[model samples]
Target: SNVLIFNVGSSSLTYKVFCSDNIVCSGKSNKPFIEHHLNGQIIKIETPILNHPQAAKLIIQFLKENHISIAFVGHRFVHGGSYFKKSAVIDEVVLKELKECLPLAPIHNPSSFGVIEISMKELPTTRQYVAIDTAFHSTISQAERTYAIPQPYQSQYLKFGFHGLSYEYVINSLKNVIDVSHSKIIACHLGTGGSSCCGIVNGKSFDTSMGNSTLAGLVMSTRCGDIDPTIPIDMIQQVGIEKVVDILNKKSGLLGVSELSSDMRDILHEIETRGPKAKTCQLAFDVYIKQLAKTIGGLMVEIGGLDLLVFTDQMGLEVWQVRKAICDKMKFLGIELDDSLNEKSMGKKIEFLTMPSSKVQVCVAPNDEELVILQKGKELFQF
Candidate 1:
């Protein structure tokens, strides 16, 4: 049974049709592409896909022509809101429940909605399911899940974290290899649209970078993280609220904070060159690491202490300098790393750079988020 995994991003659609049985075909597109190239689970084509929906349709058609039977479809839903803590099969009721929380996640929900909609129209025979990123933190304590607010306000919307897809992948893989039952862990998944860090305890999410909205926790590459709570309210009272809503949600974060650029590579270059952009980029990177350290520090408090700090994703893997930079700021918080172990480390493998006696540990892992989504998806779809 080949399950088609569609991880629709803000700018791309990552589609893979696969199973332990075998991979039928897979491809990720920034814009709509032809069926011939995307007909197999292995996509080698390079182009921009117009949208996720169109890309999904292209995949379905490819499956049909290839005579490959698709057992299930697992979409990477950014949020399941507060109701769903695990992957769920798609239906009118579930869709409606998700739709009700649209106000909370405009960017991700709409993209997921598009992916599902196209699947329904094009792959009528396929049973589409959702693997929510929010589902991974289901067991987080209410105390950790809540915000300090009045009962009414607290009940309104406290915290719905993101990056659970990668987090779930890392934690599960971690447990089989290490005895981290009560491990204090900080998992950082960095990409174009990335989060700073998530503090976890024994594979359960305790606190995450982003909060009720993506803006609350980490300063995203393109998003401006949190500012004065009154900023939005003041905008509404002064300028039109709707105008600023789009700006804050869409245009803020690393891009907003660093005014120079949002891409981490550029920031790294700035840091390396130590040019004028160095100061600005350093400020952005510093803020990013500080928040990550804060989240990791807070989680340490919960777990009584820390065991390991794991970094994943493009920036997290390839950029040792960046990791060093982040850990450097976090040393006071007990994240001291052995410079020797770090220098000889290769990217994307599990490695510890801690003194034998240091209480805190450090590691870099390349996660397989697709597998987590696929496993959860299979169980939810019962396929």
Candidate 2:
């Protein structure tokens, strides 16, 4: 049986068709373009894809043209809120609860819901499941998940970490090369769109950077992260709640600060090309690195100590400058990066960037969220 997995991001939709454990084909859609990979061939198509549903329609069409019949489908749901604890087969009740979660992760959940809805409609008989990004962090202690608020509101709002699928995949991958069962590990899922850090102790999630929503943690492409609550409240009073939400969720972060592109690549390019003249770009980069280091440091303290530091996802694995800058700030923790190794480390495989004598080992590990969804589907459907 062939399984299809939909890994939805804030700005992209990635799909993979797997025959058992091997991927038969895979593709990613980012607005005006779709890049498809099958066998050893690469195909690029340019068109206007307005939303996740439109992207899904094109992918489904491609699958049909290729004569690929999907027996099961898995989706990466960004936030399950308080409704879901693990991967579940889609049903009427599950769908209703998923809708309730839309407001929880306003930036990501709606896109995932659109893709999931289209997938179900396109392949009516295929068993579909949702593997939540918040599920893997369910093991986080109540103390860490709780906020200092009053009564009913405090009970209602609790920290639910995101980027769990990436963290789960990283932990599973580390088991092959290290003693993950007893190791204190910090895995950074630094994507271009969204990013977070996870502290795993004894192969389970102890603490994570993102809280309740994807907007709470690291500096992202467009989202304002870790802002004072008073600022938002004050903004709401002045500009109204809707505009405040729009600014924080859609116009802030790298884009808001630099007044340029939301992408880190563009920010880096500006800094490199303009040097000292790139004042805003330099400040944005500095803030991004500082927040990442601060979160990593706090998690390291909470998890007792870090035995291994991992960098995964897009920016974490491919951007060597990000790794070097963050590691440079962590020298007090005995984390030393071998400059040559760090520069060469990419997302291809697990590449250690730490010198042998460094107290804390640091490495770049590949994050396969789609594979995690695929495995979850297999187990849930008993395939």
Candidate 3:
């Protein structure tokens, strides 16, 4: 029997069916997987599954209606906290621990639980697994993981970096292309809601930008990344904490700074057209680049030097301007970006964005997170 997997994103959900190493059936739109009694077939439909639980319900309904039997089920958990060093079976204790992580990753933790809850109720007998995104970062030492909050608070609040699954997959995908066995690699996973920069030394995580939460690192599409700590307190003094939280997570970032839009393409369009708000759009774009470059440089120091720089995820792989801007002043670290190469590299699976003479190798490699989840599933439930 094939193992079923549900991949939940910040705003989207996709379900994939795998037969060993191959994806037998996969769909993300409205309907579930199918079978033609032969080759692999994929079909996307239009449906109303806006949340993770709804997607789970629909998948369960499809299974029952089609009389499909699944041996194991898995979900992508954005934050597994400190309890789970690796992917594990979800039980009552795990659920409780995950529930406590609500404050750490307010947007993703609860949403992950919603899907896990539905699976437990609808498919009680099937083996359920929770794949942790932070599992690959267990190699980070306590010195690097500790926060500066002082005393008992500092002891509990550690840098449990996000997007470990994506980084792990990036390292694996680059194996044939480059010898990542003992290389100093920097992997950047940029998306609309969440983004992070990881320093990988010899296939293990060394340091990451996200500390204690996903909202800490890069300025996302809507998230106000790396803001002054006291601003939230000031906002709460005037407006309540709930409203403050909403603004910090949703109303800020590229949207807040640009004021016109959150999408990078739209902001770039505004800047190119030299609209009335062109300067503000430029500021937002510049800030995003500066923050990303500064952090990448910091990670370079942590890992001694940078050998391979890989860009993954949506904005990181698609938008040429963002990539160019981030690598603009990073030549000091030998990260020379070929403008023509970067422009032609968009939407490519794996592309080299630097010239031959450049000391560092820059690549735009789209991450396959589902493959990592499938690997974890196989490890957890082997016959």
Q: Which one wins on lDDT?
A: 2
Cα lDDT of candidate 1 equals 0.73
lDDT per residue (tens digit) for residues 87-151 in model 1: 77888888888777566577778878888878867777778788788888777778877888888
234-294 per-residue lDDT for model 2 (tens digits): 9988999899988998899888988888988888998999865379999999999988998
Misplaced by over 4 Å in model 2 are 9-14, 26-66, 121-124, 379-382
Candidate 3, 1-383: lDDT as tens digits:
67888877766666777776766656552343322222354334456435678877776776666666777788888777778798788888888887886676677778888988998899988888988898889999998998777889987778989888888877877889888887999999987678889999999999999888667888888888888899889999999989987898888889999998989899999999999999999999988888898889899999999898889988888898888877777877787788888887775577898987889988988776677787778778872
Output the TM-score of candidate 3. 0.88
Q: What lDDT would each prediction earn against the true structure?
A: 0.73, 0.87, 0.81
Model 1: CA > 4 A from native: 35-51, 121-127, 234-238, 332-336, 340-346, 355-357, 378-383
For each candidate in turn, the TM-score is: 0.86, 0.88, 0.88
The per-prediction CA RMSD against the true structure, in angstroms, equals 3.3, 2.9, 3.3
